[PDB]
Homo-oligomer: A and B are copies of this chain.
Amino acid sequence: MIKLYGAPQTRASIIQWYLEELSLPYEFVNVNLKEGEHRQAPYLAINPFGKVPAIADGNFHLWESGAILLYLAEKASTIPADAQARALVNQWILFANSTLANGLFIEAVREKEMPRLLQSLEKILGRSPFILGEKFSVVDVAVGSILAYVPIMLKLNFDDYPAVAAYVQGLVQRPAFQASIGA
A→B interface (CB under 8 Å)? 44, 48-51, 60, 62-67, 70-71, 74-75, 83-84, 86-88, 90-91, 93-95, 97-99, 101-102, 106, 116-117, 120, 123-124
* A117-B62 in contact given A67-B87, A90-B71 (Cβ < 8 Å): no
Chain B residues near A93 (CB-CB < 8 A): 67, 94
- In-complex Cβ contact of A87 among B49, B71, B95, B124 (8 A): B71
- A and B contact pairs by CB, cutoff 8 A, 5 listed: A50-B120, A51-B99, A62-B88, A66-B94, A106-B106
- Residues of B near A88 (CB, < 8 A) are 62
Q: Which residues of chain B have C-beta atoms less than 8 A from A48's C-beta?
A: 120, 123-124
Copies of the protein in its oligomer: 2
**Contact: B101 with A86, CB < 8 Å?**
no
Query: Chain B nearest CB: distance from A75 CB in Å?
Result: 6
Q: How far does the alpha carbon of A50 sit from the alpha carbon of B62 in the complex, in Å?
A: 31
CB pair B49 A116 closer than 8 Å: yes
Are B64 and A74 in contact, with the CB atoms below 8 A?
no
**Chain B residues within 8 Å of A51, by CB:** 99
A98/B99 contact (C-beta < 8 A), A83-B71, A91-B62, A123-B48 known: no
Q: Is the CB of B64 within 8 A of A91?
A: yes
Closest approach, in angstroms, between the C-beta of A93 and any C-beta of chain B?
Answer: 7
